[PDB]
Write a protein that binds this DNA or RNA. Structure first.
Ligand SMILES: [Mg+2]
Ligand SMILES: [Mg+2]
Ligand SMILES: [Mg+2]
Length: 217
RNA sequence: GGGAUGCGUAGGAUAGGUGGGAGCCGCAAGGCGCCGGUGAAAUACCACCCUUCCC
């Protein structure tokens, strides 16, 4: 454990209080920020890249891009993803730097049918890689609706070259208990992949534009 | 810790990074951002992690 429901709820409730969080012209998001000490990057001490489905659904859906198959096309549309790219539309993207880079930047997940895995990696890959993103395969079944929905509420817990973990934990209109639970999920995904309880320095939580609040331990 | 600092090319520009982000400051006017665009990467705003210097 890196934290506990109670200390997290304590911090989160404080991060959402008008004291630490002024009101804005949009529903802000809540973030979890974990920093680490004495961690050796080149040794895989804190190498992360975990897909984490949030237990308590936020009022803001994560942007998902989906490249289905004729069969899945309609089911994909149902899940109402950020954008649906048919296999034909994908081919036409080859060579188009701008549209591809846009797609890579304004989308969090890229779900590709196994038949377009190669196509997607060549056309979207070079744009996803540097952005810390990547494509993930869709199941071969026809109704993908649920899979997409799952990613519409999944966050990426990854590290690149800094001893820290920054993740979207939900929106500010949620109950501290719920945010605390998603925080747990993110936390559990870190522990699961690496024992860094001793390297942990601090854990902050905050709204998109509110003051950071350290979690007590 | 507080104040500074970071100059290939392209990008109205000295882009150290990353997460949040569709808004931010302002009575307003207006500025800034998104958008559009360039790029390997995007920039307001909120934060966290760095380089170098000062205290
Ligand atoms: Mg440069
Ligand atoms: Mg970003
Ligand atoms: Mg910056």
């Amino acid at each position: 454990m890196l934290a506990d429901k109670e200390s997290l709820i304590e911090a989160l409730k404080l991060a959402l209080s008008t004291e630490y969080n002024v009101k804005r012209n949009f529903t802000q998001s809540v973030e979890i920020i974990l920093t680490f000490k004495g961690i050796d990057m080149k040794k895989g001490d804190l190498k992360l890249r975990e897909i984490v489905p949030l237990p308590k659904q936020p009022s803001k859906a994560k942007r998902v891009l989906v490249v289905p198959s004729s069969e899945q096309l309609e089911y994909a549309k149902k899940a109402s993803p950020k954008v649906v790219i048919t296999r034909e539309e994908l081919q036409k993207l080859q060579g188009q730097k701008r549209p591809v880079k846009k797609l890579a930047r304004q989308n969090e997940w890229f779900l590709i049918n196994q038949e377009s895995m190669a196509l997607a990696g060549r056309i979207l890959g070079p744009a996803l890689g540097p952005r810390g993103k990547f494509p993930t395969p869709l199941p071969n079944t026809a109704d993908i609706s649920e899979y997409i929905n799952r990613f519409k509420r999944s966050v990426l817990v990854k590290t690149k070259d800094q001893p820290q973990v920054q993740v979207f934990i939900g929106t500010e209109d949620m109950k501290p208990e719920d945010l605390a639970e998603n925080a747990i999920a993110v936390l559990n995904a870190i522990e699961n992949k690496a024992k860094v309880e001793t390297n942990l320095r601090n854990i902050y939580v905050k709204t998109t534009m509110g003051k950071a609040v350290k979690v007590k331990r």
